[PDB]
Amino acid sequence: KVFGRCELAAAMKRHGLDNYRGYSLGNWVCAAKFESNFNTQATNRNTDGSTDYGILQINSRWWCNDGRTPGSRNLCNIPCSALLSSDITASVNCAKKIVSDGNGMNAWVAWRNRCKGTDVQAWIRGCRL
Which window, 38-46, 50-58, 85-93, 115-123, contacts Cl ion (CB under 5 A)?
Answer: 115-123
| SS3 category, 52 | strand
Would residue 7 show up in a list of annotated catalytic residues for this protein? no
Q: Indicate the residue among 26 and 54 with the shorter CB distance to Cl ion.
A: 26
Q: Tell me which residues in 94-113 interact with Cl ion (CB under 5 A).
A: 110, 113
Which residues 25-54 are close enough to bind Cl ion by CB under 5 A? 26
- Which residue is closest to Cl ion by CB? 26
Q: Is 101 flagged in the annotation as binding? A: yes
Q: Measure the CA dihedral 32/38/42/47, to 10°.
A: -30
Q: Using CB under 5 A, which of the segments 4-12, 19-27, 40-48, 78-86 binds Cl ion?
A: 19-27
CB of 82 to Cl ion, least distance (A): 15
CB 80 within 8 Å of CB 94: no
Contacts of 107 (CB under 8 A, 6+ apart): 98, 99, 101
In this structure, which amino acid lies at residue 3?
Answer: F
**Taking CB under 5 A as the rule, which mask of x and - marks residues 51-70 in contact with Cl ion?**
------------------x-
Which one, 9 or 88, has the nearer CB to Cl ion? Answer: 9
Distances (CA, A) of 33 to 55, 65, 79, 107: 8, 24, 23, 16
Q: Look at residues 104, 102, 53 and name the one whose alpha carbon lies nearest to residue 74.
A: 53
- Please give the positions annotated as active site: 35, 52
Q: Report the binding-site residues for substrate.
A: 101
